[PDB]
Amino acid sequence: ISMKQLLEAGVHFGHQTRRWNPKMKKYIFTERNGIYIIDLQKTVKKVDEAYNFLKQVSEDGGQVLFVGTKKQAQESVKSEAERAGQFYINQRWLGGLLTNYKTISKRIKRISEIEKMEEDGLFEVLPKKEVVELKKEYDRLIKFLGGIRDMKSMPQALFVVDPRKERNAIAEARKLNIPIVGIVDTNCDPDEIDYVIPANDDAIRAVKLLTAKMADAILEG
RNA sequence: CAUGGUUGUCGUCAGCUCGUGUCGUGAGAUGUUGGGUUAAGUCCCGCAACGAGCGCAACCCUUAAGCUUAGUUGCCAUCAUU
Ligand SMILES: [Mg+2]
Ligand SMILES: [Mg+2]
Ligand SMILES: [Mg+2]
Numbered sequence: 001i002s003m004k005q006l007l008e009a010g011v012h013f014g015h016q017t018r019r020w021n022p023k024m025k026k027y028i029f030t031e032r033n034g035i036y037i038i039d040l041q042k043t044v045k046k047v048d049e050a051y052n053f054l055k056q057v058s059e060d061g062g063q064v065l066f067v068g069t070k071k072q073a074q075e076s077v078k079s080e081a082e083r084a085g086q087f088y089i090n091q092r093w094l095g096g097l098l099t100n101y102k103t104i105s106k107r108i109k110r111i112s113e114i115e116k117m118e119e120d121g122l123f124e125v126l127p128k129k130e131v132v133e134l135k136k137e138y139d140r141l142i143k144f145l146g147g148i149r150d151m152k153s154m155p156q157a158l159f160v161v162d163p164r165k166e167r168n169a170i171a172e173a174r175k176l177n178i179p180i181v182g183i184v185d186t187n188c189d190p191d192e193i194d195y196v197i198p199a200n201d202d203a204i205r206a207v208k209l210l211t212a213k214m215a216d217a218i219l220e221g
Numbered sequence: 222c223a224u225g226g227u228u229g230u231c232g233u234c235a236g237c238u239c240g241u242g243u244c245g246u247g248a249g250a251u252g253u254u255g256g257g258u259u260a261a262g263u264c265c266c267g268c269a270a271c272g273a274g275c276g277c278a279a280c281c282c283u284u285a286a287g288c289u290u291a292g293u294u295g296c297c298a299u300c301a302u303u
Contacts, residue, residue: 038258095251095269100242129279168269171243 010203014186027198050195058221061155073161086216088147140186
């Protein structure tokens with residue numbers, strides 16, 4: 001990426017000074033209109049490191065999980081993950097998604113079973129009330145577990161659009177020692193994330209640019 | 222007041238719990254709370270919970286309406302008769 005591209009994206013924009021995290025001071029360049037401005041020069045170097053890492057994991061064939069429950073990133077996470085053929089979560093992070101994957105795995109299997117029953121044509125045989133509730137279960141499973149249906153093993157890396165929003169995802173990854181690549185805004189804390197990209201996560205344009213670049217690395221691998 | 226079996230009672234009240242995960246030094250907690258909703262821990266939505274079980278409900282019996290099958294010991298409209 002280039003600084004001009006980043007400036008157009010709105011990556012430089014940051015949260016209000018009051019809501020900042022002091023640990024991210026290095027990344028901050030200046031304060032304008034009561035908003036800290038991310039240093040793009042640091043961002044470009046950071047983007048490169050994460051891009052290299054994601055290409056490396058993709059070269060190894062390691063799976064990557066994209067998390068963007070934030071409204072801005074929901075659409076971007078879905079599209080880029082599909083492009084790169086990687087797992088995504090854009091609705092809600094179920095507690096114990098990775099730590100309790102033994103239970104979660106069964107829920108993934110359930111989605112296939114519900115489809116199988118429809119394919120079998122048991123659905124017509126089943127009582128209407130039972131078929132309605134079965135459909136409702138399936139839709140709920142698709143809503144939350146749709147992105148990771150294909151996943152059968154722990155993702156080699158996680159991509160998080162907003163670490164502060166996705167606290168549970170960060171915690172589970174750190175417990176399981178999974179490397180984290182994240183878009184960290186001024187408010188967020190960078191210590192937890194292994195690969196930190198300092199950027200605005202409140203802009204659809206900004207998130208899309210960064211997630212696309214990461215997807216490209218996965219595509220390259 | 223050594224017991225099995227059987228029973229009353231709170232109360233047919235909507236509870237009571239567990240596995241895995243997570244949190245807590247720990248006893249614990251979460252789930253099971255919250256916003257609505259229901260007869261209902263009923264259901265929905267949200268939510269470090271994700272699920273599951275015993276309860277709830279439903280399946281059963283009886284009662285309130287038809288159809289088809291059958292018609293004696295039941296019934297008698299169509300007629301004779303008593
Ligand atoms: Mg209780
Ligand atoms: Mg229940
Ligand atoms: Mg009952």
